[PDB]
Amino acid sequence: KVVIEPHRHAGVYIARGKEDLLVTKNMAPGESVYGEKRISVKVEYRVWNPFRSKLAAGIMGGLDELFIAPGKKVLYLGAASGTSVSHVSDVVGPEGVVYAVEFSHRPGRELISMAKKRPNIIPIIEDARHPQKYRMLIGMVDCVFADVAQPDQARIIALNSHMFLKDQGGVVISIKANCIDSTVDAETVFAREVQKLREERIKPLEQLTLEPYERDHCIVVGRYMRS
Amino acid sequence: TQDSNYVRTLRQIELKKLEKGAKQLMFKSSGNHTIFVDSREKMNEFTPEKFFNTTSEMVNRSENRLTKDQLANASSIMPKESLDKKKLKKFKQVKQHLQRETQLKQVQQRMDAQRELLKKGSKKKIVDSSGKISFKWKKQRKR
Amino acid sequence: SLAKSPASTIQILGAEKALFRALKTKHDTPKYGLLYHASLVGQATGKNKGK
Amino acid sequence: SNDIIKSGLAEKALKALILQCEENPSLKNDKDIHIIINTGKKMGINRDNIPRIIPLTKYKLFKPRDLNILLITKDPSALYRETLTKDEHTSELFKEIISVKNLRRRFKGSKLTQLYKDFDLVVADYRVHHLLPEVLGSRFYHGSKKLPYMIRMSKEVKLKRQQMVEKCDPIYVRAQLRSICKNTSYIPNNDNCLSVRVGYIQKHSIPEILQNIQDTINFLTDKSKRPQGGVIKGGIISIFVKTSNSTSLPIYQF
Amino acid sequence: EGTLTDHERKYLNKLIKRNSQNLRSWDLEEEVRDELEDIQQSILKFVKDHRYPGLTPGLAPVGLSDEEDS
Amino acid sequence: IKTKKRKTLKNLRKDSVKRGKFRVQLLSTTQDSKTLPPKKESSIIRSKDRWLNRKALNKG
RNA sequence: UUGAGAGAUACAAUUUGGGAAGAAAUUCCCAGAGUGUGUUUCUUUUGCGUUUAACCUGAACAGUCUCAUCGUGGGCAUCUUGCGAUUC
Numbered sequence A: 001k002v003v004i005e006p007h008r009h010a011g012v013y014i015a016r017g018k019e020d021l022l023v024t025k026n027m028a029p030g031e032s033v034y035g036e037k038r039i040s041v042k043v044e045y046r047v048w049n050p051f052r053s054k055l056a057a058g059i060m061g062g063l064d065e066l067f068i069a070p071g072k073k074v075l076y077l078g079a080a081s082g083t084s085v086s087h088v089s090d091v092v093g094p095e096g097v098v099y100a101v102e103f104s105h106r107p108g109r110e111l112i113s114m115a116k117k118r119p120n121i122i123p124i125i126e127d128a129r130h131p132q133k134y135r136m137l138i139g140m141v142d143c144v145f146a147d148v149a150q151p152d153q154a155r156i157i158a159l160n161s162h163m164f165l166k167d168q169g170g171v172v173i174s175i176k177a178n179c180i181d182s183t184v185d186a187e188t189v190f191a192r193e194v195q196k197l198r199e200e201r202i203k204p205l206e207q208l209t210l211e212p213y214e215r216d217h218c219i220v221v222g223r224y225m226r227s
Numbered sequence B: 001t002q003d004s005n006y007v008r009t010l011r012q013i014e015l016k017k018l019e020k021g022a023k024q025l026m027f028k029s030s031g032n033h034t035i036f037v038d039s040r041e042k043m044n045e046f047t048p049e050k051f052f053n054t055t056s057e058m059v060n061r062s063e064n065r066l067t068k069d070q071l072a073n074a075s076s077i078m079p080k081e082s083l084d085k086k087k088l089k090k091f092k093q094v095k096q097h098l099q100r101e102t103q104l105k106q107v108q109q110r111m112d113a114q115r116e117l118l119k120k121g122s123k124k125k126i127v128d129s130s131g132k133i134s135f136k137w138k139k140q141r142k143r
Numbered sequence C: 001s002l003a004k005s006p007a008s009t010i011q012i013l014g015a016e017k018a019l020f021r022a023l024k025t026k027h028d029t030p031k032y033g034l035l036y037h038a039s040l041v042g043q044a045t046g047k048n049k050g051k
Numbered sequence D: 001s002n003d004i005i006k007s008g009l010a011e012k013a014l015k016a017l018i019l020q021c022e023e024n025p026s027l028k029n030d031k032d033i034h035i036i037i038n039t040g041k042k043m044g045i046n047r048d049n050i051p052r053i054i055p056l057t058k059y060k061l062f063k064p065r066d067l068n069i070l071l072i073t074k075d076p077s078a079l080y081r082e083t084l085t086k087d088e089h090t091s092e093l094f095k096e097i098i099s100v101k102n103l104r105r106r107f108k109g110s111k112l113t114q115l116y117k118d119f120d121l122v123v124a125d126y127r128v129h130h131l132l133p134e135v136l137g138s139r140f141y142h143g144s145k146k147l148p149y150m151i152r153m154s155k156e157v158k159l160k161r162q163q164m165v166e167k168c169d170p171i172y173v174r175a176q177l178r179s180i181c182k183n184t185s186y187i188p189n190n191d192n193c194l195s196v197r198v199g200y201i202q203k204h205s206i207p208e209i210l211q212n213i214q215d216t217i218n219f220l221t222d223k224s225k226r227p228q229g230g231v232i233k234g235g236i237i238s239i240f241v242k243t244s245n246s247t248s249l250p251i252y253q254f
Numbered sequence E: 001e002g003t004l005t006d007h008e009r010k011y012l013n014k015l016i017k018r019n020s021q022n023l024r025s026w027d028l029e030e031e032v033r034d035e036l037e038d039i040q041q042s043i044l045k046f047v048k049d050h051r052y053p054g055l056t057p058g059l060a061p062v063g064l065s066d067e068e069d070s
Numbered sequence F: 001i002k003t004k005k006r007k008t009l010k011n012l013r014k015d016s017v018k019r020g021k022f023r024v025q026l027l028s029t030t031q032d033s034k035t036l037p038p039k040k041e042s043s044i045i046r047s048k049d050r051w052l053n054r055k056a057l058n059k060g
Numbered sequence G: 001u002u003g004a005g006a007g008a009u010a011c012a013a014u015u016u017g018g019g020a021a022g023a024a025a026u027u028c029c030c031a032g033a034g035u036g037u038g039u040u041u042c043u044u045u046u047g048c049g050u051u052u053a054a055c056c057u058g059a060a061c062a063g064u065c066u067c068a069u070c071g072u073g074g075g076c077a078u079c080u081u082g083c084g085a086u087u088c
Helices: A055-061 A083-092 A105-117 A153-163 A186-200 B002-024 B040-044 B048-052 B080-117 C007-012 C016-025 C039-043 D002-006 D008-023 D025-029 D077-086 D100-106 D110-118 D132-136 D170-182 D206-221 E010-024 E030-044 F002-013 F030-035 F042-052
Strands: A003-006 A013-016 A021-025 A038-040 A044-047 A074-077 A098-102 A121-125 A141-146 A165-176 A203-209 A217-223 B033-037 B123-127 B133-137 D032-039 D052-054 D069-073 D096-099 D121-125 D149-151 D184-186 D193-200 D236-242 D249-251 F016-019 F022-026
Touching: A013 A044, A021 A055, A021 A083, A044 A083, A055 A083, A055 A165, A055 A203, A055 A217, A074 A083, A074 A153, A083 A098, A083 A105, A083 A121, A098 A105, A105 A121, A141 A153, A153 A165, A153 A186, A165 A186, A186 A203, A186 A217, A186 F030, B002 B080, B002 C016, B040 F022, B080 B133, B080 E030, D002 D008, D002 D206, D008 D025, D008 D206, D008 D236, D008 D249, D032 D206, D052 D206, D069 D077, D069 D100, D077 D096, D077 D170, D096 D100, D100 D132, D121 D170, D149 D170, D184 D193, D184 D206, D193 D206, D206 D236
Parallel strands: A074 A098, A074 A141, A098 A121, A141 A165, B033 F022, D069 D096, D069 D121, D121 D149
Antiparallel strands: A003 A013, A013 A021, A021 A044, A038 A044, A165 A217, A203 A217, A203 B033, B123 B133, D032 D193, D032 D236, D052 D184, D236 D249, F016 F022
């Protein structure tokens, strides 16, 4: 037998027993969106993989306030294959809405295929430089997560956050220094990106490097200040 | 060729088992956490217990920092010492899968080097001062 | 997945039992799998079937 | 242990043994003092004729200049013999340095017996120590008075699949030989009885012999110092001080 | 309301401490922590002669007094 | 004396304070980035000056 | 024996915060920080001297013919006792 421990952030649990893992509740029982493990305690939990995805790499690193709650609507930018998007949908439950944006068609097919069975995911196949194109589909959102590996991540987050994000909402960005200068220490690039977000309007709250899960990756969490 | 196929199949088995075990185990995070604070007075008054609103013993735990409001079971399941021993045994099993995989890799590399010596071509024995035996082939194009 | 498989896999697809028992017991591997029922392999005769 | 040292019964036994050795000519022939240790349980280690060195912290039994020493070496004997003769540290240290093949060729039978008469201490390379019983004869090995010790002369470490280079280190050789001469030794057996030489009658005083006995007890009974020490299991029921011909006088009766 | 008494909230602190102990009992042990860290790092990233076993018991101990000129 | 004063000035001008595993970093004032260009990266452009003053150019 | 800066760092006193006990005096536990001294590494500056080296490359193994592989016999137990690896 195993025990389910409620994690600090809502909608996230930890399996306890002979082996310990990070888990989320399953929206569609009896199905796995990819090759992750399922634990039945009844209620079924899918197992997060922090090496595979970067959001609960930040959770395992101990982010303070994730801005992702079961009530909230989340705008996911850079949603390749929907693997992390399924768990974000599990966190926001049936009430919350996750708008998952992806440009490339090859993860686009499987993002559509997973959003077929997951109701609360609204898939968007559209380039993230241009928020005005999918403005019909989005309302206001509580948080914006970014996983794009682009040089102008700060500009993309600026354009999307000015247009869709509410006041006092949250921005959670994953930054890799290799898609930036990459010939200096990664701390320098991270400081540059934090300064860019401050210029844009996002007031940063915290920064967390993702060792041992990713190399030269950080999660920067901040709050949007429209004023 | 049959020998090399056998060792390759064993290495592939061990590599898939290593991948499965690595997915099965969790790893503790060791990463820098920085908090941005607007004022120097709040910097000098920064305490992680009050900021995270959590217990001082739960500060160093990173994966599940529960707040004091949320806090306001080693027995059952399994006794604690044996449970810790079995978790360490799972980690040791994954490490042993890794060691078997790299050992089979080195064996297969040696077999493939000999199987390349068996073929058709002009080769030169190169003896390093360290004593490693290498072979360099002539610049000639395969007909 | 079938596209990402190389040609050597596609030749022996469907003959996994004989393939892996030979690879584990150092014996000769199957020359062919499900593709024995293609029309061209049927027109081939003798040792030319594996070719 | 501490009670065994502080018991006046042991000291009275030591004066009694010394007086009996002085009075009785048969005991006056003997010159060495042995203790007979009754281990509580069986030792469980087969005898292998390999002396194991028991350290003596307080006093030294012998100096290397006092004894007559035979060194038996592996037989490219020129390097070892020439190095030990030429070096001033070990020039006068060894009465004779011989190889095992030359020893086999030269000394046979009665010649071996007069060799045993001549030499008091025998040490050898650990690589030829196992060959020694056939070469030295049985009349060295019976009784354990002059069992050949094991010394390692090159200080190099043998590794698998690689050669071991042959040198001779005179400082290491004289250090090992000094330790052998200043320290007493034991050979394990299967049954409970053990015999350890603790002192020499003429050259040692009674408190010195008692301190050597105490150090021997601590080294053998101590749980650490494995595998040279820690061989006694179940404690010591009784110790018996005696010479070669004298009867056993009991101390530390438990 | 935020108006808990000083005599009050000791029960709250005791409940928080009990829940903290129960949760922290799941985590690990201090002794096994170093071994788990070393094994996780590996995952993520006297004399002996083998010919002559009798050398280890037969060897005489060497000392600084022995390696001295006298 | 002078070293103690320099240490006190450095401690006053320091903007990052570590607290165990965590390290608190000051957010800079918004006025400075508005009123001035960003500060130069010292080593990278010092490479150019070292090259221009290299010893192979006998420069006296 | 050029200065500076940063990190690791043992010990010493000195302090912050959470919680518990205690009437208080205080004590304990947990999480730290700074300072002094000691240890050590890295970075950079300056002085002086060298101021060219490393590596790859052309038809660059081979008459005392070279090499590979499967065998066979022998030496090394006073030990290269020999790994699906290269003991001679």
